[PDB]
Design a protein around this ligand. Structure first.
Ligand code: QOY
Length: 298
């Protein structure tokens, strides 16, 4: 196996993994690896109609998300189908470390599809999980693992008022641009768009985005994609919620400005709970240092 290194970008539906390199010249390059010998539940999706989570789809996602997001991994490409790639991923710098599929199957969160030392480990992992009755081998149908996914809040005003600007636990599921996200609100499972109050990063269009838009996307995306966070629901604008993300490592709204990836905006600065004085001040910090969006050649 031609072994390769990477960083976990995200865990997808069916526990396919997105792995990215270090950025050199532009946005980092990404690889979608599907875990080779194993089957996991497909998450909730929608198109002609809403289809719900399969049983054990979401608990599997969470398991690997909580273990992997932003770890350095290594991976092999067991095959390439006619442009999907199949392979193994190991937590750590070398290939004798934790095989993630083995960890998956061991919790009862995945099973093998319809031999060798690798597939012997997985049968062992499957039989340990089937004997201990973990995950989908547990005595049940699994219905309690399926989320009541709501893709629209019925009345945003009431819903924003209901929480009284008290931080709602949340997972960030997608970053459209540097200052708007898709976030999964817990414990209800409302999947909603959240814009950061008081800022606007540059945006994407057509075949050509504004300057630093991919930069700001990457910035917010590398720090927050598939992380547990808390979000202060501060107001709404149509189906979009205005709000502010809390994470231990800092305030993303506050950083984006201080690193010259965003500009203050007047309409939405009033609802910023954490203090409109401080956003105005961090804009000035990046301005005075002539940083990025504030360069003389831009
Ligand atoms: C998990 O990571 C994060 C999640 C959310 C936020 Cl708001 C920040 C981070 S961070 O720690 O990775 N980066 C930085 C923190 C502090 C100062 N700076 N300056 C430039 N970068 C940072």
């Amino acid at each position: 196996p031609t072994v390769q290194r990477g960083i976990i970008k995200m865990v997808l539906s069916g526990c396919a993994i997105i792995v990215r390199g270090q950025p050199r010249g532009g946005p980092p390059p990404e690889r979608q690896i599907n875990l080779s010998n194993i089957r996991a539940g497909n998450l909730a999706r929608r198109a002609a109609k809403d289809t719900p989570d399969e049983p054990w789809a979401f608990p599997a996602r969470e398991f690997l998300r909580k273990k992997l997001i932003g770890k350095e991994v290594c991976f092999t490409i067991e095959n390439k189908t006619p442009g999907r790639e199949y392979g193994m991923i190991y937590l750590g710098k070398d290939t004798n470390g934790e095989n993630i599929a083995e960890s998956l199957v061991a919790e009862g969160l995945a099973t093998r599809r319809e031999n060798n030392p690798e597939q012997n480990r997985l049968s062992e992992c499957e039989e340990q999980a089937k004997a201990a009755k973990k995950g989908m081998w547990s005595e049940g149908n699994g219905s309690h693992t399926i989320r009541d996914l709501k893709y629209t809040i019925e009345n945003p005003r009431h819903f924003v008022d209901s929480h009284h600007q008290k931080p709602v636990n949340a997972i960030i599921e997608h970053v459209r641009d540097g200052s708007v996200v898709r976030a999964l609100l817990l414990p209800d499972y409302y999947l909603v768009t959240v814009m950061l109050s008081g800022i606007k990063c540059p945006t994407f269009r057509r075949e050509t985005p504004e300057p630093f838009a991919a930069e700001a996307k990457f910035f917010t995306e590398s720090r927050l994609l598939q992380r547990d966070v808390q979000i202060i629901l501060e107001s709404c604008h149509n189906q979009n919620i205005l709000g502010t993300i809390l994470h231990p490592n800092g305030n993303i709204t506050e950083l984006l400005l201080k690193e010259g990836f965003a500009r203050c905006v007047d309409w939405s600065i009033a609802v910023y709970t954490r203090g409109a004085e401080k956003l105005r001040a961090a804009e000035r910090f990046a301005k005075e240092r002539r940083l990025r969006i504030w360069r003389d050649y831009v």
